Every structure is written in structure tokens, then in C-alpha cells.
Design a protein around this ligand. Structure first.
Ligand SMILES: Nc1nc2c(ncn2[C@@H]2O[C@H](COP(=O)(O)OP(=O)(O)O)[C@@H](O)[C@H]2O)c(=O)[nH]1
Ligand SMILES: Nc1nc2c(ncn2[C@@H]2O[C@H](COP(=O)(O)OP(=O)(O)O)[C@@H](O)[C@H]2O)c(=O)[nH]1
Lengths: 335, 335
């Protein structure tokens, strides 16, 4: 059992997404973006409390158990739906997901990871493959372009909040992820910054980081958070994610510069978790009253096009049947 | 007095550049490019042995004294030419240069720094302003674009070797500087990589760095070098550049991973210095035999255009007078 005061809104959006209506209907979403090796999957590991594999969208559904506190997991992709038993079984199951989902560049097909735990927020996130600028190894030359196209698909929509992951040890102005966010959101009204790797910041440089997190260099309405996740040695030693939280807490409390950020409510995964639930709820709340008319408008313009060209047909009869299903599912809200 | 076996070639190119002929005549060059805060000016500080200020092209002319060993410096920009007395006087003089040269974005006007010292290589470099992707602060929104245009002006030319500065603590595939190099040089035949900040690499991650420097991730004909320059605390303590070399030496000799790179001749500023002189000489050598005909071809096509439109006139009579001066100066070679 969950908090039935937060779940209905989150579950509603998840159900609409799972209907395959997002091609024609923008749905409230938090898209996670970052340059390759910015620590994006680390943040997800910390938020979900589970290890993820060493590309295509990943829908992460986190559900906070208020009740009996039995860890449950589930992975869905295509026709597969597989119940996970242990938390350390998860990495294995996504590895498998990522296998079936990728035959030969980037895939637009969704893998959905659902986790019910005492230690997870009530939160849905869409994680998007890391941005590269140079093509390395045996991957195609247009892989960067394709990654960008997949990212734009989400982030160009007004209904998407961009969650930008940036390492503290790189200049904020050089981030491609943030650059893309500024492109679609010049005012910086639907972008949140997560800084990582605060332990790797050059000594004498920490004040620059503080300036960023305090919203003084590149301004974001919704602000910034700073986090410390497992370093490579800690991953190499298979350090538990529970201990990683404990270590993060100690790191910020003892930090000569970052303690201020902690006291200002701008540090640690637990505080990030709460901030992301608030942001998600506020953002779904914004779309709630409009959904019924947007569905109606779009069902109207697709019926127009149906009449124009046909009256490819059976494909448009499948789009409309999905939109009808969206209207029905919305009519059930909040139950 | 200098080694008159290396100076004639380097001085020849410098004299042609100073004639203002590079608009119509590609000249052998090493352009230094990097993302903002990649440690680019640090590398230049180490190579030149002098401190540089905290934007427009900077032509760095380094001349190794074989003779009496009296440190000499000179800064030229527009009509100014100012003789520098001390090595620590330099930062001040470029600050002044950068003032006169920038009235209100990026300037294409050249500031030329000439240094004659026992401790400098025989080397000319064109340093280009750092790349940004996000516009911060009170700077114009198209500043990134303008920086890129200035960089492309140099690096699109076959006669330009791109010297790409990349920090070891960022994923090689995410570098915009390297991305631009790959764009104009897909084969990777006229690009050199300099990795910086090897001390800031995450523990358990050093092997990735080694892989890069050994030319195994993104392949460059001319290869990679790795260097350690002053960190911010050391700059804050005004650590001498002589001691910085000593420290770099000790750092690589004692490093559990990077010692191999040192023994493979791929580390330290002194080894970089020698590699850059070789590369410059080889590259000027490549253009030497062609220069006379290229000048003639271009003097021919500008006389064609002179005839076409005119026969704006006095501007083309000034381009041709510069090309005539280039042909004369070449006719003096090697004296
Ligand atoms: N020291 C340190 N290392 C981190 C931190 N966050 C992430 N990393 C490391 O940075 C690397 C890149 O992180 P990852 O999550 O794989 O990046 P992604 O490619 O953006 O998903 C990994 O080796 C992590 O161990 C941090 O807060 N501190
Ligand atoms: N620890 C460490 N810091 C470095 C190294 N090289 C450069 N830095 C620092 O990184 C910052 C950016 O360097 P800078 O040369 O100003 O970058 P630019 O903007 O590319 O010219 C400066 O604060 C330097 O002190 C290095 O090898 N080690």
C-alpha cells in the first residue's frame, strides 16, 4: 500500500504513457539527460537504491512503500513482463532488457523498471542515453545526432522538465546537456541541475561550484542540487547503496565548502528525491485540468486528417483507438 | 643567437603571417583549441615559462636561446610594440594588449607574444579562445557561435595542425574541441591531443586515460601527450613555473599508472615542447616547396577578379601588394 494522495496523479500519467499515446499527446515528464560519464546512471542507482548495468529510453517507476515493506521489482519491454525477486537481481534483468530491445543505433522503444521499496521516492523518470560529440569505436558516425533526436523528442515538449546531470569538475558553460536544455527552455523555467562528483573538484575551485548550486552563474527557476555517488573504486568494491548514502551524508557534513549547501537544502540524494517528487506532482498538476481538452483537440485533428486522406488508413484507426483509450482512462481518475 | 637550422623556417612563416596575407594564403600553423577550463592557458604558461592573464587569437613566438641566455620579451598588437623586461611583467602586458584589442564579442586581431629564453622551445603557436556551449553572464548569446567561426577560420585549412587540449577527468567523446577537429580532419591526420589534470582522475579510472594516451580509443596519427600543470591552489600560492616542472616530473615518475606513459615518451611539458617543435618543422617543411606557386596562383586569381570587377578597387590593390610582399619575402629565404 502507498500514499493514495500522490499515487493517483503519477499512476495516471504512467498509464497514459503505457497506452502508446505520447506520439500525439504530450504527457508530464521528467527527462534525465547528461553528457556521457556525467554520473547520470549513478544518480538513478542512488535514487532507486539498486545497481544498474555498465541505448534506449528507460522509464524508472519508483513507488514508496508506506505499508508492509516488502521489496518488489518489475521489468517490462515489448511483450515481456518479468517479476524481479531481489534488488541485486535488477542489473541482470535490464541487461536482458537492453539485449532484446537492441538488435543492431539508438532505439525509441521503452524499457520500464518498476520498484516498490521503503527506500525509494514516489517518482517517475525518463532516462535518456548520454550525449556524445565524437564518435569512437565501432558505433555509427551519426550516433550523436540520433541520441540528440531522441532527447529532443522529449525535451522540446512544454510538458517535459529537463533533469540535467553535470559533473562539478567541469565548467558549467561547456555542458552539451545543459546547452540543449537552454535551447528548448531559454528562460530556464523547466530545467533542474544535478551536480555530481563534488569530491573530484580541484582544491581552490570549490567556491565556483557553490556559486552554481546557489543559482548565481546559470539561472534556473527550479534550481540546482548537488550529490555524491559511488566513485569507480567503490563500484569496483561493490559498496552497498545504503552505505553510499551514509558516506554522502558524512561527506557534506564535514565539507569546508559544501556544508553550506547541505544546510541550504541543496545536497544529498534523499533531499533530491523529495525535490523531484514535488516537481513531478506540481508538473502533473499543471497538465491535469487540460488533458481532457487536449485529447479532444487531437482526436479532432486526427479525425480531420482521417477524412482528408482516406475518407495508411488502419494506422490512423489505431492512433484514434489509442486516443479513445486515453479519454476513457482519464475518465476513471482518480480511481 | 639561436639554432640557425630551425629558425629560418619558423621565422619565415611568422614574417608572412605578420604581413597580413593569411586571408588569401594558408600558412603552416599549430592552432591551440580547447573547451573553456580545459587547462589550455596552463599548457601555454608551462611551455612559455611565463604567467598569462586570468578574447582574440594569441600568437605565441618562443625562441630558444643557445647563446648568452638573457631573458627577453616582446608584445605586439596594432601599432604597439612593447619590450618586456621581466618574465613576471608579461601577464601585465597582455592584460593591456587584451584591453586595447577589445572595445566592446570576439576579435580577429592578433596579439603577438615573443619570448627569448633558455627554457623555451623553438615554437610558434596560435592560441584560440576556449569553446563554450551555454551563454552565461553578460556576454552575447551568439558568443559560442563566434568563437567557433574564429576557430574554423584556422582549423579548416589543411595547413593547420589542431592542438586539442582535453582534461583527463572528462570523457574524450564529449569534448567539443576534439569534435571540431574530427569534423575538419576525419582521418585524424593533423590533430594532436594534450591531456591535462591527470592528478584529478577518479581512482580506478586511470586505465581509461592510459588507453587514450596510447592512441587506443580515438586514433590520431600524430598521437597524444599527457601533462600536469599548476592546480588552482598552486596558482593561488603563486608557485613558480620552474618548480611546477619539477613537481610534474616527480608526479609522473611516482604514478602507479602514468609512469608507463612517461617511459613511453608521452608525458611532461619538456617532452611536449620537443614534440611540438618536430611537428611544426615537419609541417612548415611540407608547405615550403609549394609556397611560391600558391602565392602565384592566388596572385593570379586576384588579378582575374581585379579585371572582372573594377577593370572596392583600392582594397584589392592592397591585397595584391601584400601578396607581392609575400613573394619577395619568400625570395629572401633562408636569409
Ligand atoms: N568520485 C565520484 N565519482 C562519481 C560520482 N558520481 C559518478 N561517479 C563516477 O563517474 C563515472 C561515470 O558515472 P556514470 O553514472 O556511469 O555516468 P553516465 O555515463 O553519465 O551514466 C562512474 O565511473 C562513477 O563511478 C561522484 O559523486 N564521485
Ligand atoms: N590539478 C590540476 N589542475 C589544473 C591542471 N591544468 C590546469 N588546471 C587548472 O584548471 C583550471 C583551468 O585551466 P586554464 O588553463 O585556465 O583553462 P582554460 O580556460 O582552458 O585556459 C585552472 O584553474 C588550472 O589551475 C592540472 O594538470 N592539474
Amino acid at each position: 500500500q502507498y500514499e493514495e494522495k500522490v499515487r493517483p496523479c503519477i499512476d495516471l500519467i504512467d498509464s497514459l504513457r503505457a497506452l502508446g499515446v505520447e506520439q500525439d499527446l504530450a504527457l508530464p515528464a521528467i527527462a534525465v539527460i547528461g553528457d556521457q560519464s556525467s554520473g547520470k546512471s549513478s544518480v538513478l542507482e542512488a535514487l532507486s537504491g539498486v545497481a544498474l548495468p555498465r541505448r534506449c529510453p528507460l522509464v524508472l517507476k519508483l513507488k514508496k512503500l508506506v505499508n508492509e515493506d516488502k521489496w518488489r521489482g518489475k521489468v517490462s519491454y515489448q511483450d515481456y513482463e518479468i517479476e524481479i525477486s531481489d534488488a541485486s537481481e535488477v542489473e541482470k534483468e535490464i541487461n536482458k532488457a537492453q539485449n532484446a530491445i537492441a538488435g543492431e543505433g539508438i532505439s525509441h522503444e521503452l524499457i520500464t523498471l518498476e520498484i516498490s521499496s521503503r527506500d525509494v521516492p514516489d517518482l517517475t523518470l525518463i532516462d535518456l542515453p548520454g550525449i556524445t560529440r565524437v564518435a569512437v569505436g565501432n558505433q555509427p558516425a551519426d550516433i550523436g545526432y540520433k541520441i540528440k533526436t531522441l532527447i529532443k523528442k522529449y525535451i522540446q515538449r512544454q510538458e517535459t522538465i529537463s533533469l540535467v546531470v553535470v559533473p562539478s569538475n567541469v565548467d558549467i558553460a561547456t555542458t552539451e546537456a545543459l546547452s540543449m536544455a537552454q535551447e528548448v527552455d531559454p528562460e530556464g523555467d523547466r530545467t533542474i541541475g544535478i551536480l555530481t562528483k563534488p569530491d573530484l573538484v580541484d582544491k581552490g575551485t570549490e567556491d565556483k561550484v557553490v556559486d552554481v548550486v546557489r543559482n548565481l552563474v546559470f539561472h534556473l527557476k527550479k534550481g540546482y542540487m548537488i550529490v555524491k555517488c559511488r566513485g569507480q573504486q567503490e563500484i569496483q568494491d561493490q559498496l552497498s547503496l545504503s552505505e553510499a548514502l551514509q558516506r554522502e551524508k558524512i561527506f557534506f557534513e564535514n565539507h569546508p565548502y559544501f556544508r553550506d549547501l547541505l544546510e541550504e537544502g541543496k545536497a544529498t540524494v534523499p533531499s533530491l528525491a523529495e525535490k523531484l517528487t514535488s516537481e513531478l506532482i506540481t508538473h502533473i498538476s499543471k497538465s491535469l485540468p487540460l488533458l481532457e481538452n487536449q485529447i479532444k483537440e487531437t482526436h479532432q485533428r486526427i479525425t480531420e486528417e482521417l477524412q482528408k486522406y482516406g475518407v495508411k488508413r488502419k494506422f490512423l484507426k489505431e492512433r484514434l483507438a489509442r486516443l479513445t483509450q486515453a479519454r476513457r482512462r482519464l475518465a476513471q481518475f482518480p480511481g
